[PDB]
Each structure stands twice: as C-alpha cells, then as structure tokens.
C-alpha cells in the first residue's frame, strides 16, 4: 500500500463536507414533504398557491447552502496519487449537483 498520513487530512475534510451535505439534503426533504403537504392538503386552490410561494425563501436558502459546499470543495488540490480523495470528491460534487437539480424542480413548481 501507498496510503499516506497526508491524504487522511483531505479525507477528513471531505467527510465533514459529506456530513453538511446530508444536513442540507434533510432540509430539502422536509421542503419536498411540506410541498406535497400543501398539494394534498385542506386549503383551497388560491391559498395553496400563496402557501407554496411562501417556501421560496427556504428553497433559495437550500440552493445557496449547496453552492457554498461546491465552493468549499473547489478549494481542494488533490495530487493524482490521492485516488480515494479524488473519487470521494467527484462522488460528492455529482451528489450535490443531483440535489441542485431537485431544488430547481421545486423552484419551477412554486411562484409560477
């Protein structure tokens, strides 16, 4: 094996980032449930549109938190020999981008 103590520092940074992504992802899931809650709820059609648009501040905050994670990930410089670090970084960026595309779907379904 060629696994170095230096790579452990980078993997520890990436784990922390994966932990923050899970927390933002939990907020996106609570927003998805609240959106469904309005759609399958007791309010009439007009008040439903207003309740849905009230989630705009919250979806924009989730999008912003995911953008700040990408910016933090973009500060990392990982040598070619840091294979596990590079695989973990790429997997995290792709995961965040798939979450960003779900946020965009929510944005396209509110305040229309």
């Amino acid at each position: 094996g060629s696994n170095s103590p230096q790579e452990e520092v980078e993997l520890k940074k990436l784990k922390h980032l994966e932990k923050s992504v899970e927390k933002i992802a939990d907020q996106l899931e609570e927003l998805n449930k609240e959106l469904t809650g309005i759609q399958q709820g007791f309010l009439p059609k007009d008040l439903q549109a207003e309740a849905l648009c009230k989630l705009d501040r919250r979806v924009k905050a989730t999008i912003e938190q995911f953008m700040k994670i990408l910016e933090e990930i973009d500060t990392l410089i990982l040598p070619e020999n840091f294979k596990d670090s590079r695989l973990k970084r790429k997997g995290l960026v792709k995961k965040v981008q798939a979450f960003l595309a779900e946020c965009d779907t929510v944005e396209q379904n509110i305040c229309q």
Partner: protein, 381 residues
C-alpha cells in the same frame, strides 16, 4: 458593562474595519464571525434585518432587498451624475424623495425607504457592537474616516450616521490622513513632508497628495477612478478561463450562472495566491456538462491579462502631482492602502515610477485606515 475607550472606524464602500489603541499598540477587532473586516451590507427579509457577514451571506437569495454601496449615495442629491450612473448597476431600488436619494426595499412584507445615512448608521451600530463584544465595555467615542474629496454635505451625512448609531464622533478625518498617521509620518523630524497615498481597495481607486508640517495636514490634490478594484482583476481571469474552456472542450460555460460563479470564486482565491506565489492551481470537478476543469495560471499570465488596468493606475498619480504642482522627486513618503496594493506588479509599477523609492506597506493595507483612526481616537481621548 463599565465605560470603554475610544475606537477608530474605517466606514468603507464594500467593507468596514474597527480598531482600538491599547497597551501601546493598535488592535484591529475581529467581528462575531472572526473577520477583521465586516461587509458594509444591510439586508431586509420577511422576518428580520441583517447586518455585515449575515447580510452578504444571503445576497444571492435576496438580491433586490440587500443594500450595499450606501457610501456612494451618502450626502448626495438624487440628480447627482454619480447617483444616476451607479443605480443602473445595483439590484436594489433608489428613489427620489424631494431631491434626496433613498434606498427602497421590501421589509417584513411592506415597502420601506431609508436615507443613505440611515443605512450607514446600521453598519456603524454593528461596528460599535463589534468593539463592545471584544472589550467587554461600552463604546461611545469614535473617530470615523471619509474620502478626502467628500464635500460639506457628504461629511455631515457621515457624522449624522454616527449620531443615529449612538456614537459621539470625536472627529471626522480623511482616509489618506489616517493612513499617514498609521505610519507615524506626522512624527518625523525635519521640514514639511509631501506624502502620496495610493489607495486601491474596496472597489475604488484613490490617489491623494498631502503636506505635513509640525502636525498640520494639508490636502494638496486628489485623483483616481471610482470604479476600479479587485473584481475587475478577477473578471479578466474569468474571461481567460472561459476562453481556455472553449479551446480545450469546445463548450461555452458563460450562460450557466453557477459554473461562472464556481469559476469566479476560484479565480478570486488564485489571485490572492499570486500575490505571494508565482503560480496557482485550480481544480473544479464537473464544472460544466460533467467536465472537470483542472488548470493553472502563472503570475506573469495574470499580469498580462490586467496589463492596461495595472498600468492605468499611474495616470491618476501623474494627475495628482500636476494638480499639487509637484515633481515626483518632491515626494518624501509613498503609502500603500487597500487590498489590491498587495499585487507585486502594482508595487513594481509604482516603485519604478518613483525611481526605486521604498514604499510604506508593512501595515495590513485592508486595515491601515482604521489603524490610523484608532491612534487618533486615543490621542483625542
């Protein structure tokens, strides 16, 4: 909380800084987020009002209701050429109230307007609080700085912002005067000294020439560019990288706002690296259409991309010397202020202009103006 000392405040266009003289030294005070400078930003939302870091951190979420650049409006009439040109570029509204400008926002679901001095009073309240949190004592006395070119109305409106914030403004002093005080240029033995202050930071470029004689400061001339700073240097790097992505991948990333933002954030940080290293590396995974962007830039390439902008900083210097009726050989002291003066090419262009004369630059250039204001606040105590 018992009574505390007097502080010095640099109330800047995009950022503000507060310092205190204690134990024979100036200490620049960190804010609640551990930052030695605080954004001159105020945000209005559906539930609250936010100041500093908390306001700039949500600008992308709420651009229309987040105010900054109040200093560009303070003490001005609505029909001022500067107000008219500037507003076109701000996401927030600027309205006319009986000849005076007001920022108009949506706050707690209502349309509300504020005068520039009310916005600046909120930033000053935050600077006051920052000082109090560190000292664990009440802060009332302050020296607040203004540009040397500010007129009667702009100086009075700044003083009113201090008054509304509950501050006893001991003195309103010019930013180049505070920078000269920071380096103790007024304590040097001899005859009259001619000082040039080159200030490149906050998004503004100011050149001032002063004369100091037995503790008395006189402004001889001012010159510069109101819209020149680090963002312009970052923009050139963004343009360069966008062109590079087209050459390598035959794809245009410029219409994707998130890809441009990721590239822009990494360019700002690479620029900072290039002030102390000769090369910077950037790695951005899945930047656009799943393409990873791994690249580098040398200091020399960064200098070539900004060559006209860097060279152009000398025109205001030439102009300032002409209006002061001084030759460049008559300048006793040159002071560097503002974050962008850390750029080695700028320092080189200025030193070569003054035929190899050493520059005053040991004080953090982002903090130098607050440093001088803190010393002055202590001398006035």
């Amino acid at each position: 909380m018992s009574k505390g000392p007097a502080v010095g405040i640099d109330l800047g266009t995009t950022y503000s800084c507060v310092g205190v003289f204690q134990h024979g030294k100036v200490e620049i005070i960190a804010n609640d987020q551990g930052n030695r400078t605080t954004p001159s930003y105020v945000a209005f939302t559906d539930t609250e009002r936010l100041i500093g870091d908390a306001a700039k951190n949500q600008v992308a979420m709420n651009p229309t209701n987040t105010v900054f650049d109040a200093k560009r409006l303070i003490g001005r009439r609505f029909d001022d050429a500067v107000v008219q040109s500037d507003m076109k570029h701000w996401p927030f509204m600027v309205v006319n109230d009986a000849g005076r400008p007001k920022v108009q926002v949506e706050y707690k679901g209502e349309t509300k307007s504020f005068y520039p001095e009310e916005v600046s009073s909120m930033v000053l309240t935050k600077m006051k609080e920052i000082a109090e949190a560190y000292l664990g004592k009440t802060v009332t006395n302050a020296v607040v700085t203004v540009p040397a070119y500010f007129n009667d109305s702009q100086r009075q409106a700044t003083k009113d912002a201090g008054t509304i914030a509950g501050l006893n403004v001991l003195r309103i002093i010019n930013e180049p005067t505070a920078a000269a005080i920071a380096y103790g240029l007024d304590k040097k033995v001899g005859a009259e000294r001619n000082v040039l202050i080159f200030d490149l930071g906050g998004g503004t470029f100011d050149v001032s020439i002063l004369t100091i004689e037995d503790g008395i400061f006189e402004v001889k001339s001012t010159a510069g560019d109101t819209h020149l700073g680090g963002e312009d240097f970052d923009n050139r790097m963004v343009n360069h990288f966008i062109a590079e992505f087209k050459r390598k991948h035959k794809k245009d990333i410029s219409e994707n706002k998130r890809a441009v933002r990721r590239l822009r954030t990494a360019c700002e940080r690479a620029k900072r690296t290039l002030s102390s290293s000769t090369q910077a590396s950037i790695e951005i995974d899945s930047l656009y259409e799943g393409i990873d962007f791994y690249t580098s830039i040398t200091r020399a390439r960064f200098e070539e991309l900004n060559a006209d902008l860097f060279r152009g900083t000398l025109d205001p210097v030439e102009k300032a010397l002409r209006d002061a009726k001084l030759d460049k050989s008559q300048i006793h002291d040159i002071v560097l202020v503002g974050g962008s003066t850390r750029i080695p090419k700028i320092q080189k262009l200025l030193q070569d202009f003054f035929n190899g004369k050493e520059l005053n630059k040991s004080i953090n250039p982002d903090e130098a103006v607050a440093y001088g204001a803190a010393v002055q606040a202590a001398i006035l105590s």
